[model samples]
Target: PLFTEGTYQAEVMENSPAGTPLTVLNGPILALVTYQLLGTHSDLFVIDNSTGVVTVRSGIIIDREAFSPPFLELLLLAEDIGQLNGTAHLFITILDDNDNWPTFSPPTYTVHLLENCPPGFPVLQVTATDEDSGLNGELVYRIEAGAQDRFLIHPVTGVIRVGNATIDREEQESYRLTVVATNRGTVPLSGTAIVTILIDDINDSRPEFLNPIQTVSVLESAEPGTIIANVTAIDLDLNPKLEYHIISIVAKDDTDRLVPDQEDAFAVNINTGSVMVKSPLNRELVATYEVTLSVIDNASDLPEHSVSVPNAKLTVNILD
Candidate 1:
């Protein structure tokens, strides 16, 4: 049997000011033992020759966030009246403390929402992180008062969405919301973020022709500048004034496009939706005229998408 056997293990926490010494062993050379420390944590531990005790004096400060699963190891040696013994390992584990605060990335978020955007619409997604581990580093997200009902923020995922709050461009066009990030710890810490939401206008209704189609007749010898039809329309928009134009005398897909007939021989009042003959009309040359009129709103938006309705029939039959 190998007589040079191992002894009981030892342990110590970080930051003791006084050094940690190896365990005092009992053997045949009673009361005559001396000690030596070696390896990774050698400088932190020293032995007292007078009492055979060991302690961690100074230098090593353990911060769990910096060195997770922190462990300290040292090689030990003991000699009692020249009977020397050596142990390969002595271990010490470092524990955690809630010393760090939660933090968010980018710090601020911004978005644009149309006034008609439905409730629960997605707006912003904010993310946060914690330095500590376990419960100390686990994070939670929340929104503060100012934007309470207007926005909904998910606790775990930090997602902000449109809430039930009434959003109207005419009433209030913008909002500044505050979001907070927190951690679950004895000394819980928090971080904040600002979210700005701008409300935009939506073009809802398109221009509509007031009364289906109207039938009108004009003689072939109808003189120039003759009023052919009073084609009317209405538009419910910011600027309701409409634009009008004569499509053509004959409805033909000459260009194979979504536009009106191209053989135009009539003019329409831009302000009033009235049709008037431009060139002289001869019944023998053209029997029936399929006059089409188009209406659209004169929108003032510089950069915007608009709606236009082209070509409603205002048939004209030339009389012999």
Candidate 2:
């Protein structure tokens, strides 16, 4: 009978129609055996006729009592007889037990965030769990990627924190973070997680005049379409609602006649606050004039309102 390729032991039945072959063909007679079961560890066997004596050569064979089926065919061999009518069978079985260990899905983790986060605030949290039971299920976290720099991870908890003062989102917008977790076991398995932090925007700047002192000149003959002066202001705040207005203006004593008490001599565009000479200037009436002005942001036009640089001054000269 041909035996399957593997470690085994078998007993020969005596007094059968086909007695055990005295000169068994195991070496050259066997063909195509599993490579794994071959080599120095392999052993061969044969049986005796009367006393059913068994002999071992290269490898051990599992006996019929230990297994079933065409007993694990360790090697293949052919037998020749005048008239073969019966068949001889051997049985073998395989053994299996939990020998493979559990493993982590990903080996490492990383993350990023903006430095704007306040001190003592929670930046982010990481978590890990194992598939294995008992000690293997207990996971511990730590900082493995950027441990020496700005980031730190709690040993007991998975919370990550900013170790030192960091640039705010207004200065720096993003950061990268990496973390690792290991199971509590004799042979612990580990995993990594990555996080990306994005900082949001904040408005903390106020508005200020670009040109604090505005100056302009106009001829005595200047008429309605004349653009006397352009007043402008700047705001560091990125808000689009920032606006400017000519809150108030004062004319110098000597040149008071140039700007009549009437609001029509010169008109300031409410939208742009650009001063235009609406009426002709009279050199005989006035030569030079100084005025004080005020501008403010009208984002919300309410009594308890928002205002910037309350008062500004301007000087105007009229030529004959």
Candidate 3:
């Protein structure tokens, strides 16, 4: 006497309840036979000794994620009262369900990059995983919020990149993005994460003078430290530290341009751009001094990053 099938397969869902019928082993119909399951994982199931019907054991759960190798392999034995026996292979394939949500690694991300970086510059990579198998576990990525057409993410790779051509730190210094990972299940499951991108500073802006020219009149007998005028400029860069200087000075009436000797007559505060008299002035020697002022907004020691605007003019008139 022998069984009807030598090998069998059962397609059982992971969500199946206990006592769910898996398969039936048909032994010789004319003989009195009993069935038994024997394997390392055979304890998870039970077989009817009289009818050869197999079922999941009560109070036992067969989750797809709880087992390794994704399936159960077992051997079934059929014994007859005549002392004859037969063996068959039983394979239980656990079907996947969309019961698990996608999960992100590290939970959040923070990255720093220079402003106006090249378009499509990769900012960072994000990863998410699912415990389910097949379509329920495959994940696709997207930027769910705060993108503002400024960023893009690869659906498969989860790589975030710059999408806008103009990413100015002066306009917006930082961005908070919400990244989402969704699985490809019939009833999709999703997970979310936060990504912070901080834009660094660059010396791409020039110091702008509020007024192109400034003029002040002072008595010829003014003290050595008398204040003349103040020159002001602003920069668009972050935390700008501006330096002011009187680059050139010339007596308006001196046709000979012999003004280097007159340079000591006035000075400018390097920090505040406050022009002041360094020495006592006399209208007889010079009626007016035409000064060219320069403003630089570079605090760092890097010479290449220094930016200067030298169009500001200051005129100091000596009152007779």
Candidate 4:
């Protein structure tokens, strides 16, 4: 009669690396063997200690292809456990396969720069690594945009360049440029990356006042804190609030008398065009004054934003 537990095993075949150990256990004896040739089929042998001989069990194939690593297992009979004190070991090794692709650390990067930046300026760089052999992991980059005139990307070096001086920080401050990198292999695979370009501000020019003449009249008997006149100047800048300034003030009397100390007699609010009397007006001191107010911008030295009001004369009359 065939042994119930140990005799139940008929034929078992598995694929493993060359030189891997295979074990066979019979009633009282055990034997271990290994395959010599890779990818060669090994004739399986069975051991029956009762018969004291070996028999052909099945055919096993040995795999020598590059795979992962190696592992081990054990084979035993139900009766062997009761008889034997220690466990058996069978080592199995598996090869590796080139299946993984190159991976990038940061798939996307965002950057910013001024539109007036010089050419050949470095924007950003891309990097990737592969676990495969040879040039299978070698990468090359390219810019893939629906429009071609926006930016330029180097294929191998991953250097991005501004194609034309088309970027305007005033119009558009930032932009998103799409980039793609591909592996140089038999069957190429590609990944996408994004580069963001943000433009910085450039002090182009200052604001300029439009009209050059501002005239106002006040009563000679006008006390301090009285509203003398409202003098307004216009500017063409986008944000005209903080870009303009009252650069200089030149005040004179009707007798062509320049009044520098009394200049503070009339207060001009730089923000608002309202001119008020800071000091009490006396017709005897000065009836009419020809004031020259020069207003300029806060940006550059360009006079395009500056204006001088030569006709900003203040007329004063005493009311008895």
TM-score of each model, paired residue for residue? 0.54, 0.45, 0.81, 0.45
Residue-wise C-alpha lDDT for candidate 3, range 287-320, written one tens digit per residue: 8888888888766434544555447887877787
| Pairs that clash in candidate 3 | none
lDDT of 4 by residue, 1-320 (tens): 21323321222223433333333333323322211111112243343433323333445443333323322232433233235332232333323233456566687777777665665666677776666544555777877762246567777788787766655555567778777777775657777776777776554434433444555555676777787666555544334443223334455555667666665666767776566777777755665555554554454334543444343444443333
Those runs of model 2 whose alpha carbons end farther than 4 Å from true positions after fitting are 1-118, 128-155, 160-194, 234-238, 253-267, 278-280, 283-306, 310-312
lDDT of prediction 2: 0.50
Under the 3 Å rule for N, CA and C atoms, how many clashes does model 1 have?
9
lDDT of model 3, residue 278: 92
Q: Considering lDDT, where higher is better, how would the candidates rank from best to worst?
A: 3, 1, 4, 2
Between prediction 1 and prediction 3, the one with superior TM-score is 3
Instruction: Pick the TM-score winner.
Output: 3
Model 4 misplaced regions, further than 4 Å: 1-102, 112-115, 130-136, 146-150, 166-169, 184-188, 200-265, 270-274, 277-320
What lDDT does the true structure give each of the candidates? 0.65, 0.50, 0.80, 0.51
lDDT of 1 by residue, 9-108 (tens): 4544334345544333332112315656577656666656445456766666545555545666665566556575634345555555667778777787
lDDT of 3: 0.80
Steric overlap count per candidate: 9, 35, 0, 9
Report how far off residue 316 is in candidate 4 (Å): 12
Clashes of 4: 9
Query: Candidate 2 vs candidate 4: which has greater lDDT?
Result: 4
